């Protein structure tokens, strides 16, 4: 969860709204196991 600790303060002349971009990934202690097919299958009918 993300909360406002203080407040987005800006002076006269600058936008009252700005955006944040989130970038995620895994740490170096991350591993995976038990290979399986993905939940999605990107095909409806036959691919011609």
């Amino acid at each position: 969860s993300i909360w406002y600790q203080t407040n987005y303060v800006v002076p006269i002349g600058a936008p009252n709204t700005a955006y944040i971009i989130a970038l995620a990934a895994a740490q170096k202690n991350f591993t995976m196991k038990l290979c399986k097919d993905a939940s999605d299958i990107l095909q409806t009918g036959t691919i011609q």
Partner: protein
């Protein structure tokens, strides 16, 4: 790192690029809530936009710490302090800061 679609609400084609970023703006100083999302990487939701989330779908089990880096794209003159929290299992959606 890949872009996490925290703001996964818009669905019409013309507004899809808006999922890539969420906003912040001048508030009323009441420690208001900005956004929330589950940290589950292999679960439907924001994580599905990341390469981690997709690769994750090819494996039944995972283990490890995750990391999310937030980049503020406001103007240089804009300032602010945010509280980003991670609530381990059992803790319900925090009602307040």
């Amino acid at each position: 790192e890949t872009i996490l679609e925290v703001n996964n609400v818009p669905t019409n084609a013309t507004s899809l690029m808006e999922r890539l970023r969420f906003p912040v703006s001048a508030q009323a100083g009441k420690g208001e809530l900005c956004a929330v999302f589950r940290a589950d990487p292999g679960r439907n939701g924001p994580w599905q936009s990341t390469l981690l989330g997709q690769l994750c779908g090819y494996y039944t089990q995972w283990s490890g710490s995750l990391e999310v880096t937030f980049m503020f794209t406001g103007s240089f003159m804009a300032t602010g302090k945010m509280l980003i929290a991670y609530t381990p299992p059992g803790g319900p959606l925090p009602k307040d800061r």
